[PDB]
């Protein structure tokens, strides 16, 4: 029952192809719930999960105002950062930002986050104390000095401990049937010969939510870390996620191998075997 909210901002310049594009998305855990795209025919915050749609016109207008101001602010930031690095007006560059709050199973604020990056590299981050900054280089120190003058950290701290938490808890109550429901993985094991003397055992996890899962293979009750091919957890497209883990084993030492599954949705951790 641990929960979090995050907003993700991407601002991208594109010299010769108009003004920089700004897009914001918001998530509770692995569920996206809002988007805004400065490129959209009519730029406005749009709902992306059913439980947010009940919010009134003043919510939507409020979000849209902030994202419209951010679109313009981030356009100036891109100009500023290109200068800080002595970069030419010809290349395309990206500012990213992620921020939000974590709650424990009691619904109390575990910690807040606010981090920004430039061209995929850490640039500036709010420290866990929510009162000071870590700047990555001399360019980021200029941003740090501007941000101290506007008392940004103080503003973030009031938001992260206050509104962020209060709205997260509202979303969690409004979307409780999905947001607070864990769906356990459906699991099986497949066997495929690779040669006469070896076969692939593949342990499958499907239909689970949230995305966090652990899948491991053991040989005689010990971890097979270096020998497991582990695929990135992937979205099914219906809110749920999928993962598999595979090992190549000698024929027929198949029964010495066990797949282990841990997920919040499960009554109990699972131990599975190939069942010929």
């Amino acid at each position: 029952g641990s929960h979090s909210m995050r907003y993700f901002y991407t601002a991208m310049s594109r010299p010769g192809r108009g003004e920089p594009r700004f897009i914001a998305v918001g998530y509770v855990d692995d569920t996206q719930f809002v988007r805004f795209d400065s490129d959209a025919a009519s730029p406005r915050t749009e709902p992306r999960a059913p439980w947010i749609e009940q919010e009134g016109p003043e919510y939507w207008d409020r979000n849209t105002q902030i994202f419209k101001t951010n679109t313009q602010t981030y356009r100036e930031s891109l100009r500023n950062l290109r200068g800080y690095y002595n970069q030419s007006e010809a290349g395309s560059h990206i500012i990213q930002r992620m921020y939000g709050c974590d709650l424990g199973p009691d619904g109390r604020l575990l910690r807040g986050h606010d981090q920004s990056a430039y061209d995929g590299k850490d640039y500036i981050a709010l420290n866990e104390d929510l009162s000071s900054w870590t700047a990555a280089d001399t360019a980021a120190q200029i941003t740090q000095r501007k941000w101290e003058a506007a008392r940004v950290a103080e503003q973030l701290r009031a938001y992260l401990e206050g509104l962020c938490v209060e709205w997260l808890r509202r979303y969690l109550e409004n979307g409780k049937e999905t947001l607070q429901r864990a769906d356990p993985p459906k699991t099986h094991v497949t066997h495929h010969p690779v040669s006469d003397h070896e076969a692939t055992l593949r342990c499958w996890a499907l239909g689970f939510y949230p995305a966090e899962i652990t899948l491991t293979w053991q040989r005689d009750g010990e971890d097979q870390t270096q020998d497991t091919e582990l695929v990135e957890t992937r979205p099914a497209g219906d809110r749920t996620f999928q993962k598999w883990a595979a090992v190549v084993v000698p024929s027929g030492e198949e029964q010495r191998y066990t797949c282990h599954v841990q997920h919040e949705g499960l009554p109990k951790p699972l131990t599975l075997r190939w069942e010929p």
Partner: peptide, 9 residues
Amino acid sequence: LPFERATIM
């Protein structure tokens, strides 16, 4: 609900 202030970097 998102953070209300935008600040130029």
